[PDB]
Design a protein around this nucleic acid. Structure first.
Ligand SMILES: [Mn+2]
Length: 206
DNA sequence: GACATGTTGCCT
DNA sequence: GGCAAGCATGTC
């Protein structure tokens, strides 16, 4: 096989917007306790800018017991429970209270384990339903709160390997964020034409 | 203590 | 497309 490295501090240490864009095409890897490796290529992200960003948990520089990952070194995971039953996986970027939400993956390896984790553990699921959402991907990759405040550059259960297929400048759609002035600002980024994206913005494309 | 707020699967 | 169940969390 190929000599496989992992993306380190050099990659994670950049402003939220650049990082959110740079994530596109990269491959998120999860190794389960049973030895099974799961792989998914990132196709959709969101940038949360910090104290000025009225949609971010760090708005006005607010630091709570929950959002501490956002104020820790670039690469630190911020995993929180939303709607009492779902997880959102964020990665701290460079900049006070700034992070990036992972929204969607193209599933590449371990799809049958993903389908079990998505259906057998809670509530035939098509391949498109596996990772097409921030909380869907957390379920499919077995991400929960025990992953909160871990370092994505150093952790032996979850890492980021560099992807062979990365989009260039014109292939990236900058659109409004999902479920959030700061509601309308284009801080969501996804691969144009990808069937694995959670929500298509047909207005921000045309 | 109260209570407002924050994605997915089904349904309209 | 619309619609809330879900309960963790933050705030008063
Ligand atoms: Mn509700």
């Amino acid at each position: 096989g190929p000599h496989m490295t992992r993306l380190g501090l050099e990659f994670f240490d950049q402003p939220a917007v650049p990082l959110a864009r740079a994530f596109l095409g990269q491959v998120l890897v999860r190794r389960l306790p049973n030895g099974t490796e799961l792989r998914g290529r990132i196709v959709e992200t969101e940038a949360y800018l910090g104290p000025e960003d009225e949609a971010a948990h760090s708005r006005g520089g607010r630091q709570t017991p929950r959002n501490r990952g956002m104020f820790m070194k670039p690469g630190t995971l911020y995993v929180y429970i939303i709607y009492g039953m779902y997880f959102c996986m964020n990665i701290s970027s460079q900049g006070d209270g700034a992070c990036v939400l992972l929204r969607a993956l193209e599933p590449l390896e371990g799809l049958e384990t993903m389908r079990q984790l998505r259906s057998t553990l809670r509530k035939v699921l098509k391949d498109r339903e596996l990772c097409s959402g921030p909380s869907k991907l957390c379920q499919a990759l077995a991400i929960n709160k025990s992953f909160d405040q871990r370092d994505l550059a150093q952790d032996e259960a979850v890492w980021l390997e560099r992807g062979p297929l990365e989009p260039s400048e014109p292939a990236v759609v900058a659109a409004a964020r999902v479920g959030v002035e700061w509601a309308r600002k284009p801080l969501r980024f996804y691969v144009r034409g990808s069937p694995w994206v959670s929500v298509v913005d047909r207005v921000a494309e045309q």
